Amino acid sequence: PRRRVIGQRKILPDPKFGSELLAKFVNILMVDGKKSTAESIVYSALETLAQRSGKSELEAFEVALENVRPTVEVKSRRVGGSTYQVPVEVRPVRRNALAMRWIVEAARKRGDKSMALRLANELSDAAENKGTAVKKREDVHRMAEANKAF
Amino acid sequence: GQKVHPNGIRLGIVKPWNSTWFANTKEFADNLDSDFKVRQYLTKELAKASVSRIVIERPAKSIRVTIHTARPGIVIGKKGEDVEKLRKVVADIAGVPAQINIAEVRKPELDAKLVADSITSQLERRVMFRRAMKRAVQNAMRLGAKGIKVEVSGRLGGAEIARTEWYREGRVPLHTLRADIDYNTSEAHTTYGVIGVKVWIFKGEI
Amino acid sequence: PRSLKKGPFIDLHLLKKVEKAVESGDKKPLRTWSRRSTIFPNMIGLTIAVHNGRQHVPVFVTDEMVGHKLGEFAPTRTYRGHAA
Amino acid sequence: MKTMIYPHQYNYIRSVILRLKNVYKTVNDKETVKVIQSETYNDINEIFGHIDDDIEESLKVLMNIRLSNKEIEAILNKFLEYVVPFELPSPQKLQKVFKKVKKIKIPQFEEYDLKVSSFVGWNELASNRKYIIYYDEKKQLKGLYGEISNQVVKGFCTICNKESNVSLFMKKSKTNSDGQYVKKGDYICRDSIHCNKQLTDINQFYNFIDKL
Amino acid sequence: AKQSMKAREVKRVALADKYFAKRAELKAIISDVNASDEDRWNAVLKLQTLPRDSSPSRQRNRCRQTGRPHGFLRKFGLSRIKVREAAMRGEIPGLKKASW
RNA sequence: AGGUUAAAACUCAAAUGAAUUGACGGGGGCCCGCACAAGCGGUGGAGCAUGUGGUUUAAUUCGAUGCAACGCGAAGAACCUUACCUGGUCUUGACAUCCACGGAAGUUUUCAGAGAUGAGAAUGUGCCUUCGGGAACCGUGAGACAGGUGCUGCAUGGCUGUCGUCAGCUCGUGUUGUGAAAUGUUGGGUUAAGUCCCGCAACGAGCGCAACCCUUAUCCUUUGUUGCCAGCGGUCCGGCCGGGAACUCAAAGGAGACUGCCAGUGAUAAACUGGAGGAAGGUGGGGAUGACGUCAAGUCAUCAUGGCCCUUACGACCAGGGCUACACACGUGCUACAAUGGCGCAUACAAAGAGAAGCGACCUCGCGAGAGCAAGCGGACCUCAUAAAGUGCGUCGUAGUCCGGAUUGGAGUCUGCAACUCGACUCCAUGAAGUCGGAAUCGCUAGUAAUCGUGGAUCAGAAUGCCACGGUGAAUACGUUCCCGGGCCUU
Ligand SMILES: [K+]
Ligand SMILES: [K+]
Ligand SMILES: [K+]
Ligand SMILES: [K+]
Ligand SMILES: [K+]
Ligand SMILES: [K+]
Ligand SMILES: [K+]
Ligand SMILES: [K+]
Ligand SMILES: [K+]
Ligand SMILES: [K+]
Ligand SMILES: [K+]
Ligand SMILES: [K+]
Ligand SMILES: [Mg+2]
Ligand SMILES: [Mg+2]
Ligand SMILES: [Mg+2]
Ligand SMILES: [Mg+2]
Ligand SMILES: [Mg+2]
Ligand SMILES: [Mg+2]
Ligand SMILES: [Mg+2]
Ligand SMILES: [Mg+2]
Ligand SMILES: [Mg+2]
Ligand SMILES: [Mg+2]
Ligand SMILES: [Mg+2]
Ligand SMILES: [Mg+2]
């Protein structure tokens, strides 16, 4: 806001893996305040990812996030009769936030039967940079590259 | 915009209830109806008595009515003849044994209801509204009111277009809950129409 | 609908009227405001004029009509179509 | 909107229609008939000023020589709809008009009568007067009470200019301090309603008022 | 309300009190399973004969001061407008503006 | 090209200059708000609920109409309500006062009538009582009057919406100006705040702001049943019992938060920033509280009221109908379109509230809605009363489905004189649209949104509405370039 008096809110770490990063992801995946349902999906998806990855769930999650995370984004600015997309660096916390949101969106759009399956498949695809979520990151970077002049 | 009733907001803080009896839902409505009828009768009968407030209490099965009047004697009558008449009628209306107590109101200029009743009487007598308002304000300030406000609304002076005029002297802090503000209203019935008077009197905080 | 324990409902005036008509013979249509009264087997073969609010509509009671209220066979509202 | 016509005008319309029709009954020459047809058609049109399709239909029926009395009645009923009824004053207003006569009483006047009433007049036996209320050229309600003769004779009525049972009506001037007063009056129909129906010209009534 | 409307209510209350005992009995006869069908049938017809205003359902709660048919509160026996006026004057005991 | 000289008729009651207070600007500056940005969930599409417009109708009663009408008056239209229509009726009268006259009042019944009501019958015949009587209440007859949800909210009172819980709006005295006016109230900092400090032809004051008030977060004291059970004793394992007053909780009285303390910055200021302690920190959270005024804003249908109008009718009574109509348009909701789900089974954890023409257990009976019987409870006791989401397990497998639940047929239950028009609910069967919604548009910054249930008022019955209560419980705010609105100063 104009006052800019906003402060950070504490987030409890996820019980199983003791990660605040994963707790954020659960909250993004959560719908209608049903955290338990969200937590079950995330834990199920991570396990499946871990088996295929052959890595720890947290490690595997981090690899997927790294690919999806966006370095730069474009903010629209109206100049005269036209609007200019202006490349702006993404803050580290926002980088994580955008990545997680995109993965959840990507998982939901997938046609796999269960959300846990959808999430796991998306996370795996994100690790190998074949996911739709990674495509968004590529698109966001591409747009920023085009508007580098501004 | 609109403003909260000054007495209503302060009720239970610095202002007492006029009726102070306990009843269950069964009898609550019946008591209210009886209280209304008693107050209605007494006001009509004691219109010239300068009654300010009627406090109706219901101890046990009996009803105790306390009448606050600027002129105590005329309500009492001669050898308590008038008060006894009132008691008998009140008991009939109440349907229970009745007790009538008469309390004198000192400083009638400092009582909002008595001031409002005075002004409305004058307006019906066709006294100029401004003069009545100003005198009331002056009278209260002399008697030692910390502040007073008088508002008169309607077709003042028989004007086709109705207007509101208000005169305030001293402090009248309506927002302050601890502040003791005496508020009352009176309607003046004239050939032109109804003229409404509102009187606020500040008697100090707490 | 009405409880079976309570039984069928008919207005007493109508019941008396029907009985009088049955005993007498063929009669001029009975005029009733009792739309709520249930049609009974005894009424069959009798024309009963039921009020629709503005006029009495003649209804010849039949076997199929039995077990229905008289009001069902008289229409209260008149609709000839919108923008017809 | 439907044309609005005065009650006296409607009476004229009725008279001309009856006159127009009687020509068809009597006159054997089509030529003479035709001349009157045109005259009457114009007269009806003149009163209406503007003729709607309903008036035109009636006029067409009127123009036909095969017009019948039953048809005439229907045509008149339509024309009656165009007529505007006399406005009764408020009972308070009436008493204000008749300030001199306290607690003046008015009989119930038929709506049709009001519709065909150029003026409204009622007779009280106790009064032995006829109370007349009417709207003048200014359209101010004018109320007047004058003595009505108990005797009735057959003669031409001043108001309607028609021979009928008439009773002399006298209007008294305001009494002076001396007690001298002047009464001026002329024979008029005892029944105001009958006279109203007979009257075809508002001016004739006005002239009678002028005489008073 | 109109004076007639208030009068109508008074009649309905009076008739309800008059036939209260009769109505209760008749309804009980219809309710009873053990009671004969003829007895029930006669009772049904009798209940119809009794005045309609006798039924408590016909009575509508009105503000005692104004006779207003809407916004009634059973506790005070008054409509919202009159309840508010009385509350501000302190005529209703124990009633104050509530904030929580 | 035109220049120069230069009229009149006719027409208007002004045209005009300067300055003033506002308002306004696609003028400037400075702040601020779910204003944008950043997010989350919606609305607009479907079906249905509900209101409105329109159309229709005998009537579909009246009112509300940008925000600030449209689940609004109405916290609940089968009859009643009801104000509307149709028909049947009454005229000092449904409701008052007064007077005369006759009857206690009433109570029980008969016939006709849709009823209103009318014609009857029978039974009471009291109460006071100067055995003069009253007045109890029925009549009957006048006539003063009654009556009107009839009209004007642009004659009004009262009450309410709104800008806006925005920080403004003013007065006295002094001073300045011929004056309208100005000053104070501007200026420098600062605040959520005309908040505060400083300066200052102003000095003061009032209404606003804030505080005082309610509630929530912590603790202490008193009290200890209907509430509680730590330590004991005993058990029917249930605070169940004898007990204990520890604890929770109940509800009265207190304590606590003050920028108080500390550091830095700031004009040796107000203040701001950080920090410590603390349950709580700088307005701790929520609420009540709404300045002078604006909109001839809403309400003559709550009520009151000036004027006007009707008065055998614009009053009053009754039955039936209507307010529920349905080519259509719109507002607000509910339920969906599934798998973060549906269904089956098993199994946890609330708050708040209501109740005697009431809440009604248990038990029995019914597939069920319910029924019968019958405790207890005017309630920390009894009853409503089951929390649901959740969790475990199983199943369904992406289908118009084991999604959805409209519609309709049949059969019932209950309330009520009475559910045809036109109730709710249950059972069996039926199984529509809908697969995420064009242009456009709304809410929300935290215990919030979203989602999940629970209660209450109104109320015979009749909630998807309204009001209230807990459960679970987010995302995001870089920021002020932009859009919109608001405040202050300047032009
Ligand atoms: K000139
Ligand atoms: K939608
Ligand atoms: K007003
Ligand atoms: K001054
Ligand atoms: K100057
Ligand atoms: K009026
Ligand atoms: K319907
Ligand atoms: K709804
Ligand atoms: K909708
Ligand atoms: K129904
Ligand atoms: K109910
Ligand atoms: K400006
Ligand atoms: Mg009811
Ligand atoms: Mg020249
Ligand atoms: Mg829709
Ligand atoms: Mg209006
Ligand atoms: Mg109705
Ligand atoms: Mg207005
Ligand atoms: Mg201040
Ligand atoms: Mg305040
Ligand atoms: Mg207006
Ligand atoms: Mg009716
Ligand atoms: Mg409606
Ligand atoms: Mg400011």
Q: Per-residue DSSP letters for C11-50? A: -HHHHHHHHHHHHH-S-SPEEE--SSSBP-GGGTT-EEEE
Q: Measured in angstroms, what separates residue D150's CA from nucleotide F146's C1'?
A: 41
DSSP secondary structure of D166-202:
EEEEEEEPPP-TT----EEEEEEES-HHHHHHH---H
Q: For residues E66 and E77, is the Cβ–Cβ distance under 8 A?
A: no
In terms of Cβ atoms closer than 10 Å to its own Cβ (0-12, 13-18, 19+), residue B60 is: exposed
Rounded to a whole number of angstroms, the distance from the CA of C29 to the nearest CA of chain E is: 23
> Which of B15, B17, B185, B186 is best to mutate for the E interface (most E CBs within 10 A)?
B17
Helical axes A57-68 vs A132-146, angle rounded to 10° = 30
Six-digit token string for B188 = 């003046």
> Which of E85, E92, E95, E99 is best to mutate for the B interface (most B CBs within 10 A)?
E92
Residue type, D193: I
Query: Is residue D195 part of an annotated ligand binding site?
Result: yes
Rounded to a whole number of angstroms, the distance from the CA of C77 to the nearest CA of chain E is: 26
Number of C/E CB contacts below 8 angstroms equals 16
Query: Is residue D157 part of an annotated ligand binding site?
Result: yes
Strand D183-189 to strand E72-73: parallel, antiparallel, or no bridges (unpaired)? unpaired
Q: Measured in angstroms, what separates residue D88's CA from nucleotide F134's C1'?
A: 52
Which residue in C6, C7, C11 is closest to E48 by CB distance?
A: C11
Instruction: Locate breaks in chain C with C to N over 2.5 A; list the residue preceding each.
Output: none
Residue type, E43: A
Q: For residues B186 and B195, is the Cβ–Cβ distance under 8 A?
A: no
Distance from the alpha carbon of residue A99 to the mean position of ligand 2, in angstroms: 29
The fold of A20-147 is Ribosomal Protein S7 (1.10.455)
Distance from the alpha carbon of residue E70 to the mean position of ligand 23, in angstroms: 15
Query: What kind of experiment solved this structure?
Result: cryo-EM
Give the Cα separation of A48 and A40 in Å (integer).
12
Number of folded domains in chain C? 1
Domain boundaries, chain A: 20-147
Instruction: Locate breaks in chain E with C to N over 2.5 A; list the residue preceding each.
Output: none
In angstroms, the Cα distances linking B45 to B53, B108, B109, B177, E89 are 14, 20, 22, 35, 21
Radius of gyration of chain A (CA): 17
Six-digit token string for A80 = 């005269």
Helical axes D30-48 vs D53-63, angle rounded to 10° = 160
Give the Cα separation of D126 and D142 in Å (integer).
22
Q: Which residues contact B10 (CB under 8 A, 6 or more apart)?
A: B177, B180, B181
Query: In the β-sheet with B63-69, what is the strand arrangement from edge to edge?
Result: B51-57, B63-69, B98-104
Q: For residues C71 and C36, is the Cβ–Cβ distance under 8 A?
A: yes
Give the Cα separation of D12 and D40 in Å (integer).
11
Which residue in B11, B19, B30 is closest to E96 by CB distance?
A: B11
Contact check, Cβ <8 Å, B7/E91: no
Cβ count within 10 A of residue A115: 21
Q: Domain containing C75: what range? A: 2-82
Helical axes B129-143 vs B112-124, angle rounded to 10° = 160
Residue type, E70: H
Residue type, A123: L
**Using beta carbons and an 8 Å cutoff, which residues of E are at the interface with C?**
30-31, 33, 37, 40-41, 44-45, 48-49
Instruction: Please tell me what DSSP assigns to residue A58.
Output: H
DSSP run (H or E) holding A19: none
Helical axes A57-68 vs A115-127, angle rounded to 10° = 70
Cβ count within 10 A of residue D49: 9
Which residue in B7, B32, B36 is closest to E90 by CB distance?
A: B7
Phi then psi for B160, rounded to 5 degrees?
A: -65, -35
Of B195, B182, B172, B178, the C-alpha closest to B109 is B182
The b-or-e profile of D163-187 (16+ CB within 10 A means b, else e) is ebebbbbebeeeeeeeeeeeeebeb
Minimum CA–CA partner of E32 in chain C:
C5
Rounded to a whole number of angstroms, the distance from the CA of E53 to the nearest CA of chain B is: 23
Resolution of the solved structure (Å) = 2.4
Report H helices in chain B: 6-10, 25-45, 72-76, 81-94, 112-124, 129-143
